[PDB]
């Protein structure tokens, strides 16, 4: 027969070779997920939604000189490419406000903060938006394995000049490239390995492939993953204003006849990484997924910062092969196009040998390069890509590109499989999974391409959702003046006929931090909530539904207070019974173990129905009031207090010991 | 004889399961071997 | 993977003997239960008997066209299998393949062509 | 006694395509210790054969992964995900009910389609 020791190990043998080969395909090919991103640009754009609107316009960011940052610039600019010291552009994309930071917030001091690089404030910032983008209490985040991944190199910063007196060394961890990112895991409290690559302009894909490598294997759970990139002295321009290599006009014309120079910019992006088991069992938000991502380098060439086209191929089958895709589950590439006249032609023929090849013939592919918006960042080209990619998925539609009004002539463009994006195509989804990749091309020699596709089948259409009773709306900020910035902000937030109260309201409660400066509105309607805030952004509290107040100690010891008798009145919690149903359970309760002594219901006393006894007498008095307060005791205990110590004044030490557990109900009411 | 269908098949099954963890191993702890080492030192030592 | 060795072909003459043989290299012979498959020309593949391992008996079985006209045997101890036919017949020019295990066919050997010529 | 079975005798498939075989026995086919009492087969042109399915649920070891198995009752299919230029040859489709069985199956040729 089966011997039930031969056919039942069978049955354990069969369901183990299942949870191996699908354990093999979890350690190598796990897709990750993308939960939010956040990112400072030049030209005013600090958030991601101003970005994708000044994607689809086509608009520009290009700019003068900075005047405030103590550049010379009339002992600078000539328009001769030759006597060193001076520079032939007078264009470029900068940041409006690369000079400011909160010290008080992270705790630094000013000597500390004007010690800076600005780069590690301005990626502290991106690193907190990105953060409470998620939904994410950041104040859960400590003690937890997420690792933080960067990409940064030093542009120069009050290295001129002589170093003041600091005896506690302000000046070396301020500007030194690996300090930006330990700074953020002591500043936040992460407890995940941190990184900051060197990758010549490749850095940020470098950083997240191997966030890709370290979420796989298992030793984090998040990843923070970016680039950063913040000029403080000309010397960029300067030195390639002597090799002629810049733009005249400053413009980067990717694919276009007339490429002669790139343009460069600062930017700081971020970007968070989870696994996407973890993703939707926690509940987060997912926005797209990393699938593959291949590096490889560019060898042996006629030159140390040439391109190449073998390499370029054989990354992107890599790429292609490490997921387990074909070439043609594409519908358009973000390109490295900067404006090279020399490696435009190069890049486009290695995407037509792979993804033009021989292709289906009712669209061509789509070919794109956001460097013609904003221009080079030169640190975060690859993660600018990676929310460019992000923002057509979620919204989408696939933006234009600029300056391609015909197309350069040494690209073979007959063939049909490579189309360049002249206009807004719909990008709808449909019977075909949406699937589009970024390419990054580092000037040292390593070279990558990532593949991004779209968030899978999912419900979020239960946001709006309101009832007619309380809602409480608690605002917290470490100084007064940010509490009414936030509250002007909540308050012009609540003006919109689309804005939930209760969404407003749990999200308040859940997904954000609590700070020592407190403020509380409870309000039953929606204008009764705008003027509460009204008046707290107004720098007063007055009216009866606003309290607010400071904390300096995170936590207390409650006690519970039960007074004697003589405070009762008719009619205590009319409603309560009604609308809440812990109330009404305890009292309840109480009344079937008060019943076999008693001839009369507590419920029916405290609603003041025909036929019930009224409260001058004390033996009704007492157990309405004994039963009262031990009902609103587990009200309180059913919110989260939880008490520490029971002090009864005259006749509330029963009710004490009941709640302290000392008795029960049941001698208690006796 | 339904101890030769069932022994058969977990020979196929004992087979294929060893194939897959030592897959497995080789994925996640594979020793990684040193073959040569130089280094530049102060005091003359190259 | 493991290494199933198998000789004998030639020429032969219809009506009189010839055997096999095929060693295994890389698993233990003696727990295997073994098959044979004749391959002829405008025909599929063909089971024509198999002999089960030891510690299950010795017990061997074959087809309806080939019983009493050829036998199986096995050496666990020198780990070959041999098929002796007698009185072989000018249709059974064929090549002849050994099977690991008697009803899960895992595995075929390279396989002997063997002729019967008048 | 024995349960019949059958398949597609020729199905020439160009590369890159989902190909699928069928296998339409005449009796319930299962297993009560596995899933299905059933195990397909592979033999290119020219060599000997190889073992691709067992149960009618597992894969081989050694066999690509586009290979898969599915089915009961009376039906199966072998549901491959693409094809290449080393997938001509037959595939079998045997059962393991009551042995020794008698109806060894004729085989699906597979080739390259012009």
């Known amino acids: 027969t089966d011997s039930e020791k031969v056919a039942e190990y069978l049955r354990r043998a069969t369901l183990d070779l299942r949870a191996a080969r699908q354990r093999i395909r979890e350690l190598e090919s796990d897709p990750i997920a993308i939960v939010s991103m956040a990112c400072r640009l030049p030209g005013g754009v600090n958030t991601p939604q101003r970005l994708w609107e000044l994607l689809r316009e086509g608009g520009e960011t290009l700019s003068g000189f900075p005047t405030d940052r103590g550049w010379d610039l009339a002992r600078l600019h000539h328009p001769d490419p030759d006597n060193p010291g001076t520079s032939y552009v007078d264009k470029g994309g900068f940041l409006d406000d690369a000079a400011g930071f909160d010290a008080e917030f992270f705790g630094v001091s000013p000597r500390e903060a004007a010690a800076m690089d600005p780069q590690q404030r301005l990626l502290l910032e991106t690193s907190w938006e990105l953060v409470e983008n998620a939904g994410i209490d950041p104040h859960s985040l400590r003690g937890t394995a997420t690792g933080v991944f960067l990409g940064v190199a030093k542009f120069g910063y009050g290295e001129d000049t002589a170093a003041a007196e600091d005896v506690e060394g302000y000046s070396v961890t301020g500007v030194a490239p690996a300090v930006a990112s330990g700074r953020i895991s002591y500043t936040m409290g992460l407890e995940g390995p941190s990184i900051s690559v060197d990758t010549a302009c490749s850095s940020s894909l470098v950083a997240l492939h191997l966030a890709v490598e370290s979420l796989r294997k298992g030793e984090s759970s998040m990843a923070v993953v970016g680039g950063a990139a913040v000029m403080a002295t000309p010397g960029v321009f300067v030195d390639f204003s002597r090799q002629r290599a810049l733009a005249a006009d400053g413009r980067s014309k990717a694919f276009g006849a007339g490429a002669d120079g790139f343009g460069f910019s600062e930017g700081v992006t971020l970007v968070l990484l989870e696994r996407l088991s973890e993703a939707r069992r926690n509940g987060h938000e997912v926005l797209a997924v990393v699938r593959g991502s291949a590096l490889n380098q560019d060898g042996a060439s006629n030159g140390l910062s040439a391109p190449s086209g073998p390499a370029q191929r054989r990354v992107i089958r890599q790429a292609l092969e490490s997921c387990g895709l074909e070439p043609g589950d594409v519908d358009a590439v973000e390109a490295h196009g900067t404006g090279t006249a020399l490696g435009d032609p190069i890049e486009a023929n290695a995407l037509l040998d792979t993804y033009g090849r021989d292709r289906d013939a009712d669209r061509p592919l789509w070919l794109g390069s956001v460097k013609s918006n904003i221009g080079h960042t030169q640190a975060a080209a690859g993660v600018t890509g990676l929310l460019k990619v992000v923002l057509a998925l979620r919204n989408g539609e696939l933006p234009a590109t600029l300056h391609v009004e015909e197309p350069t002539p040494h690209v073979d463009w007959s063939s049909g499989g490579v189309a360049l994006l002249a206009g807004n195509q719909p990008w709808r989804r449909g019977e075909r999974t949406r699937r589009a990749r970024v390419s990054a091309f580092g000037i040292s020699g390593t070279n990558a391409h990532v593949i991004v596709e779209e968030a899978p089948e999912r419900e979020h259409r239960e946001t709006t959702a309101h009832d007619g009773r309380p809602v409480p709306l608690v605002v917290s900020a470490r100084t007064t003046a940010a509490l009414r910035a936030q509250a002007a902000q909540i308050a012009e937030l609540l003006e919109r006929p689309d804005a939930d109260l209760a969404g407003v309201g749990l999200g308040l409660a859940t997904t954000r931090a609590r700070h020592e400066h407190r403020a509380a509105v409870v309000a039953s309607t929606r204008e009764e909530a705008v003027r509460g805030l009204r008046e707290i952004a107004a720098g007063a509290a007055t009216a009866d539904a606003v309290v607010e107040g400071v904390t300096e100690v995170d936590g207390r010891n409650v006690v519970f207070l039960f007074p004697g008798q003589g405070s009762q009145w008719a009619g205590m919690g009319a409603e309560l019974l009604s609308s809440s149903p812990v109330f009404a359970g305890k009292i309840r309760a109480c009344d079937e173990s008060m019943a076999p002594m008693q001839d009369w219901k507590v419920s029916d006393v405290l609603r003041q129905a025909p036929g019930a006894p009224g409260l001058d007498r004390v033996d009704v008095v007492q157990p309405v009031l004994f039963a009262v307060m031990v009902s609103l005791a587990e009200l309180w205990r059913s919110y989260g207090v939880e008490p520490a110590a029971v002090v009864g004044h005259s006749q509330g030490e029963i009710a004490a010991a009941h709640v302290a557990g000392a008795l029960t109900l049941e001698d208690a009411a006796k | 004889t339904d101890s030769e269908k069932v022994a058969e098949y977990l020979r196929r099954a004992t087979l294929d399961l060893r194939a897959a963890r030592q897959r497995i191993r080789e994925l996640e702890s594979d020793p990684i071997a040193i073959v040569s080492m130089a280094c530049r030192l102060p005091g003359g030592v190259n | 993977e493991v290494q199933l060795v198998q000789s004998g072909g030639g020429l032969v003459q219809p009506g009189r003997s010839l055997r096999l043989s095929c060693t295994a290299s890389?698993?233990?012979?003696?727990?295997?239960?073994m098959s044979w498959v004749r391959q002829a020309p405008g025909k599929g593949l063909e089971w024509v008997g198999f002999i089960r391992s030891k510690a299950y008996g010795g017990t061997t079985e074959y087809a309806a066209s080939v019983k009493g006209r050829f036998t199986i045997s096995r050496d666990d101890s020198k780990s070959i299998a041999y098929l002796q036919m007698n009185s072989l017949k000018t249709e059974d020019t064929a090549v002849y393949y050994c099977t690991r295990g008697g009803t899960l066919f895992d595995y075929w050997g390279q396989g002997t062509l063997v002729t019967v010529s008048s | 006694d024995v349960v019949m079975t059958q398949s597609p005798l020729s199905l020439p498939v160009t590369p890159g395509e989902p190909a699928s075989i069928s296998c339409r026995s005449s009796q319930s086919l299962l297993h009560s210790n596995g899933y299905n009492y059933l195990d397909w087969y592979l033999q290119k042109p020219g060599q000997s054969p190889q073992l691709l399915i067992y149960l009618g649920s597992n894969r081989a070891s050694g066999v690509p992964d586009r290979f898969s198995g599915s089915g009961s009752g009376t039906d199966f299919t072998l549901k491959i995900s693409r094809v290449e230029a080393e997938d001509v040859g037959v595939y079998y489709c045997?059962?393991?009910?009551?042995?020794?069985?008698?109806?060894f199956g004729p085989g699906t040729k597979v080739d390259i389609k012009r």
């Open positions: 890389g698993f233990t012979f003696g727990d295997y239960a």
């Open positions: 045997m059962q393991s009910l009551q042995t020794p069985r008698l109806t």
